[PDB]
Design a protein around this ligand. Structure first.
Ligand SMILES: Cc1cc2nc3c(=O)[nH]c(=O)nc-3n(C[C@H](O)[C@H](O)[C@H](O)COP(=O)(O)O)c2cc1C
Ligand code: SF4
Ligand code: SF4
Ligand code: SF4
Ligand code: SF4
Ligand code: SF4
Ligand code: FES
Ligand code: FES
Lengths: 428, 87, 40, 258, 106, 209
């Protein structure tokens, strides 16, 4: 089984590069609001069963198994209403795969809000967008205006006996409000600080009311997981990790693209076939970051034989979140790159934990000293030790995503750091 | 926020007078049992020690903390007034 | 053919809040908690 | 409605809705704390309370977890002690070194936890953050440089003092705690913010520098002058009244004083 | 080295002084800084051990190398603060040279 | 910034701030959008609407948002100091903010910030003397596969050169808004030559049901 083709009939994210009528009455031409009434009248448990038999996982930075994640609350009513929340925040660097479905088909996101919200059993879906995503939020509420004028949302959920609401909640510019619970506190109207998870969002979410948090792909391939697949979507990918993925290939390449493809495609094919190859050839293409920022590095020695599965990248000592293929070449500055990652995490991080207040700033100061080289090589393994002291010792996985490319840089690019210690030891 | 002083019983005396020294304002006292604190492990043994030495005792019972119903899920309610606005 | 998202040039700085004004008459009656506030 | 909970092999039956701290307080083992007051709400911020939960690979916070069924909290384990020494190392990364300046000499709750629970030598050689001091009042002197951002003061001023004035501004190490504008935080119970604060960041202004808690002798009394009758530790140094502190009796005054 | 009495009311030098010979009751100075009102050094007490000069975090208390300070009456070996301050002002030309030649050892 | 208030006469709580009646209708549209229980959900878009009414958010506006929405003002200032979109310093009309983080930087964001400095005259974060352009080194703005990108006010200008700055700034200073979108031959984030996906015309209604 050597798949990774994804032929042009079986594309699941059509109208993505702009053409052929992104609004309503062109969205219904491409497949939207077609069998949605009988999808809602067939049953929510049938939609959750077609989530579980497809094996759709989390398309954000967590990779949590959906189906199971939405059957955390397949619950009867406890007095509170129920809500579906959409992380339209992107935040991780290199990751505008949600911006490209904000434009050119937000009606698929709106249909996914309605289908996933009645699949869990809910009242409203809150698409929370980033505070710099103004035209994206305006296109979202243009699609919400078209759906409400067509009568698809609100007391006739595509002409059914169901009431639903779809909102756009605008943020004000942080990556941390893309988290599963600082999402929730941002919509509740406070500092965007993530809650502790030992109360789950399925038990208490926004406003005290139980919620399901999902990413834009994680709700937006759902309304065509049930009008189009269930077993077809499970046939793509392997058994643990399945489906399609908006691969986001950026940095030092001749064609920077977002190509939607079959997941667990070779990364050789992701460089060469779609989004055509990097500058120079294959003397370059050292230091590929497979995901956005919560994935460590790869030293190009194993990168030719990398499958893009979650557990295969776990066995290849990384993770896979948003799958932003960030490519460096030999004409880069890798220590400046990862010190700019921890500069992003220092100037972004919400300041709640002790090992992300004064741990992330510590890693930023030591890696900013490692850029200039004016340190000694005895602190590289100590900075590795404080990276391992951050990892499981935080509230959210921004500590994980801040201490992981540190571990990738020490795991794969330690002799370049030793070369820079030699280069400063040449000076006086 | 500790327990290790609250764990063992103690025996202090009545605090008598402590005047200023006429030389430089030191704490000059005539009560040599004023600096005495005696550790213990049980109230019955401390009461038996005070009976066997003959001093009159004032016994105060151990004010143990009642365990509170502190849950993180009650900090974020839908109807109750115990919502925290700080986070 | 040609790039069809033409309105993202044409959006004014009040546009998304103006469509929130347009959609607030389309929204459902929102849930009530039994309390007017968290009484902060 | 009882749960069999193991704490290093013990057999404590605790009611549900509890914490790992309230499970271990029946044993007598005290998991170390900075963010959690007993009488304030749960908010895991300081991350000192990390223990391991019998062979799950992530250490969990003792503030937030209810103990589910049959968990063994290994309070004196290698992973929990490495977590405590790591979090104390990260707390003492950007702590400015004003311990001879400080009002809480022996009454620092973080000197004692670094002395009994942290590491030996800090590997910090970089440079500490400095925070502009505030003007909260003539009772609460706020040197906010040494604040560990543990948010124990803002939960008291939001929940029990009820003033809503102390909250955090910013993010990262640039997140600083206090009034954002020049606001005189002067309500009733504004002196209980000092004893809640485990750091000597905000302390008393009339007891600024006059004595020291190892030198003072701690006697007990009841209050006058308000008729609630609260238990008071009078800490006296050389026959001079130096501090008045609240003393815990859960009926009359549960660690507060006016 | 630029004016300004070095003692900052830490009170760890009587928690280490094993004779209990030091009373250092202090106040804020009403200038924003932190100093002492009282020092007391009892020379008819105290052990001459260097515990205070090893516990002083700023090296304010020091044990300058006199030994010619025998007095005739018992009042004159109760050094409060002013005798100590003009003693260190008397002996700062030698004490600072000893600390500058000795601070690599300690 | 500085994350504290230093009560200047340009930022005292007596600066003239009052919403229009259509703005107050928009405030109660936000209030009726949110649930009536927990109406302190409207701290972020109400104060964002205050920022859309005027930039350089004063403390009269940060007390006006609390006065309308009945939130405590310290709980308002928590939001207005945590979030990076909210501007408390005196900012300009056009407000250029440029990414310098890593996929957006590795294709040459150092030169687009350097040619911005050489075109304007701002070192890192101060203002022009005409108060037209201010530069803030923001971390990530989302749109990174278009590899250099700037953000004038509320629009994305992306995949562009200093030669593209030579018409964008030169039409922003002496003209209208110069067509917000990616330059250099791409349409949104397409392949530079050809298309990878959406090459076949799109699927039917219920295609492969
Ligand atoms: C620190 C952090 C930041 C995140 N940021 C985002 C984000 O900006 N956008 C997003 O779509 N998901 C984001 N996620 C992921 C979602 O919170 C999570 O994966 C959720 O379950 C949605 O994925 P799923 O549909 O696969 O379940 C973030 C997660 C973490 C822990
Ligand atoms: S890991 Fe960092 S971003 Fe996440 S809660 Fe802790 S301090 Fe905030
Ligand atoms: S509060 Fe800070 S400065 Fe004061 S004694 Fe403790 S650690 Fe030192
Ligand atoms: S001032 Fe004290 S109580 Fe408040 S956050 Fe800082 S250390 Fe905690
Ligand atoms: S003599 Fe030294 S240790 Fe003693 S109070 Fe003064 S400065 Fe502190
Ligand atoms: S040398 Fe004198 S003042 Fe110093 S601690 Fe020893 S005995 Fe006390
Ligand atoms: S003691 Fe639990 S996080 Fe502070
Ligand atoms: S990091 Fe540049 S906007 Fe993404």
């Amino acid at each position: 089984t050597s798949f990774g083709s994804l032929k042009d009939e079986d594309r699941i994210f059509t109208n993505l590069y702009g053409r052929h009528d992104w609004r309503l009455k062109g969205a219904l031409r491409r497949g939207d609001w077609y069998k949605t009434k009988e999808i809602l009248l067939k049953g929510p448990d049938w939609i959750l069963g077609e989530m579980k038999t497809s094996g759709l996982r989390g398309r954000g930075g967590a990779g949590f198994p959906t189906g199971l994640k939405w059957s955390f609350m397949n619950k009867p009513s406890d007095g509170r209403p129920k809500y579906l929340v959409v992380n339209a925040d992107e935040g991780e660097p290199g990751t505008c795969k949600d911006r490209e479905i904000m434009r050119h088909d937000p009606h698929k996101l709106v249909e996914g809000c309605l289908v996933g919200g009645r699949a869990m059993g809910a009242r409203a879906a809150y698409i929370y967008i980033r505070g710099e995503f103004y035209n994206e939020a305006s296109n979202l509420q243009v699609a919400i205006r078209e759906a409400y004028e067509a009568g698809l949302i609100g007391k006739n959920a595509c002409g059914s006996d169901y009431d639903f609401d779809v909102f756009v909640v605008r943020g004000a510019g942080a990556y941390i409000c893309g988290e599963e619970t600082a999402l929730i506190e941002s919509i509740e109207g406070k500092q965007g600080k993530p809650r502790l998870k030992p109360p789950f969002p399925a038990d208490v979410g926004v406003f005290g009311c139980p919620t399901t948090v999902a990413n834009v792909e994680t709700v937006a391939v759902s309304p065509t997981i049930c009008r189009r697949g269930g077993t077809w979507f499970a046939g793509f990918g392997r058994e643990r990790n399945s489906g399609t993925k908006l691969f986001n290939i950026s940095g030092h390449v001749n064609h920077p693209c977002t190509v939607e493809e079959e997941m667990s495609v070779p990364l050789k094919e992701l460089i060469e076939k779609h989004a055509g190859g990097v500058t120079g050839g294959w003397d370059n293409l050292l230091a590929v970051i497979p995901g956005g920022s919560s994935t460590p590095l790869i030293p190009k020695s194993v990168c030719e034989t990398v499958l893009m599965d979650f557990d295969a990248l776990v066995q290849a000592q990384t993770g896979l979140g948003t799958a932003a293929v960030i490519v460096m070449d030999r004409s880069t500055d890798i220590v400046k790159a990862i010190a700019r990652l921890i500069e992003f995490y220092k100037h972004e991080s919400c300041g709640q934990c002790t090992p992300c207040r004064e741990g992330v700033d510590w890693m930023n100061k030591v890696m900013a000293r490692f850029v200039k080289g004016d340190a000694r090589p005895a602190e590289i393994d100590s900075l590795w030790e404080i990276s391992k002291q951050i990892e499981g010792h935080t509230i959210c996985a921004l500590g994980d995503g801040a201490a992981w490319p540190v571990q990738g840089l020490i795991r794969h690019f330690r002799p370049e750091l030793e070369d820079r210690m030699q280069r400063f030891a040449q000076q006086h | 926020s500790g327990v290790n002083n609250t764990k063992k019983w103690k025996m202090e005396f009545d605090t008598r007078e402590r005047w200023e020294n006429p030389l430089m304002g030191w704490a000059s006292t005539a009560d040599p049992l004023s600096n005495m604190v005696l550790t213990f492990s049980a109230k019955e043994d401390a009461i038996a020690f005070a009976e066997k030495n003959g001093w009159s005792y004032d016994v105060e019972e151990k004010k143990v903390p009642k365990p509170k119903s502190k849950s993180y899920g009650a900090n974020f309610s839908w109807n109750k007034r115990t919502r925290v606005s700080t986070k | 053919t040609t790039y069809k998202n033409l309105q993202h040039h044409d959006y004014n700085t009040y546009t998304f809040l103006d469509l929130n004004l347009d959609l607030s008459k389309f929204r459902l009656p929102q849930p009530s908690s039994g309390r007017e506030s968290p009484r902060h | 409605n009882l749960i069999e909970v193991f704490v290093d092999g013990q057999s404590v039956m605790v009611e549900p809705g509890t914490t790992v701290l309230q499970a271990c307080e029946k044993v007598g083992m005290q998991i170390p704390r900075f963010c959690y007051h007993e009488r304030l709400s749960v908010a895991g911020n300081c991350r000192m309370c990390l223990v391991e939960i019998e062979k799950a690979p992530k250490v969990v916070a003792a503030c937030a977890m209810p103990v589910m069924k049959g968990w063994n909290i290994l309070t004196n384990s290698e992973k929990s002690k490495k977590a405590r020494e790591g979090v104390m190392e990260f707390l003492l990364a950007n702590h400015p070194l004003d311990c001879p300046i400080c009002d809480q000499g022996g009454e620092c709750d973080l000197q004692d936890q670094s002395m009994m629970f942290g590491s030996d030598r800090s590997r910090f050689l970089e440079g500490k953050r400095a925070v502009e001091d505030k003007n909260i009042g003539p009772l609460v002197k706020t040197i906010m440089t040494r604040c560990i951002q543990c948010t124990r003061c803002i939960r008291f001023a939001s929940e029990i003092a009820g003033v809503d004035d102390l909250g955090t501004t910013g993010r990262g190490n640039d997140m600083q705690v206090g009034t954002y504008i020049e606001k005189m935080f002067m309500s009733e119970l504004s002196g209980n913010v000092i004893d809640i604060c485990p750091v000597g960041a905000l302390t008393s202004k009339p007891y600024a520098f006059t004595a020291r808690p190892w030198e003072t002798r701690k006697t007990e009394s009841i209050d006058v002058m308000d008729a609630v009758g609260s238990n008071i530790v009078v800490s006296t140094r050389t026959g001079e009244v130096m501090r008045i502190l609240p003393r815990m009796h859960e009926d009359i005054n549960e660690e507060w004083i006016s | 080295p630029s004016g300004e009495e070095r003692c900052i009311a830490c009170k760890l030098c009587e928690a280490i002084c094993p004779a209990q010979a030091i009373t250092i009751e202090a106040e804020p100075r009403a200038d924003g800084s932190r100093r002492t009102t009282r020092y007391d050094i009892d020379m008819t007490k105290c052990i001459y051990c260097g515990f205070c000069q090893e516990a002083c975090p700023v090296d304010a208390i020091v044990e300058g190398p006199n030994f010619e300070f025998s007095t005739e009456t018992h009042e004159e070996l109760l050094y409060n603060k002013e005798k100590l301050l003009n003693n260190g002002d008397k002996w700062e030309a030698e004490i600072a040279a000893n600390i500058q030649a000795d601070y690599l050892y300690r | 910034a500085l994350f504290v208030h230093r009560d200047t006469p340009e930022n005292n709580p007596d600066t003239p701030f009052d919403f229009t009646p259509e703005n107050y209708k928009r405030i109660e549209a936000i209030v009726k959008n949110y649930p009536e229980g927990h109406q302190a959900a409207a701290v972020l878009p109400v104060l964002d609407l205050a920022q859309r009414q005027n930039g350089w958010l004063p403390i009269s506006a940060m007390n006006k948002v609390a006065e309308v929405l009945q939130v405590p003002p310290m709980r308002v200032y928590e939001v207005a100091t945590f979030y990076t979109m909210y501007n408390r310093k005196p900012v300009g009309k056009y407000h250029i903010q440029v990414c310098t983080t890593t996929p957006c930087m590795l294709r040459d964001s150092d030169s687009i910030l350097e040619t911005l400095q050489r075109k304007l005259g701002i070192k890192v974060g101060e203002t022009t003397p005409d108060k037209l352009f201010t530069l803030i080194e923001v971390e990530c703005l989302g749109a990174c596969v278009n590899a250099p990108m700037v953000q004038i006010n509320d629009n994305y200008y992306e995949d562009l050169t200093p030669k593209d700055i030579e018409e964008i700034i030169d039409e922003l200073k002496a003209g209208k808004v110069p067509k917000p979108g990616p330059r250099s031959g791409r349409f949104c984030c397409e392949p530079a030559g050809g298309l990878t996906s959406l090459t076949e015309p799109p699927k039917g209604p219920g295609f492969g049901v």
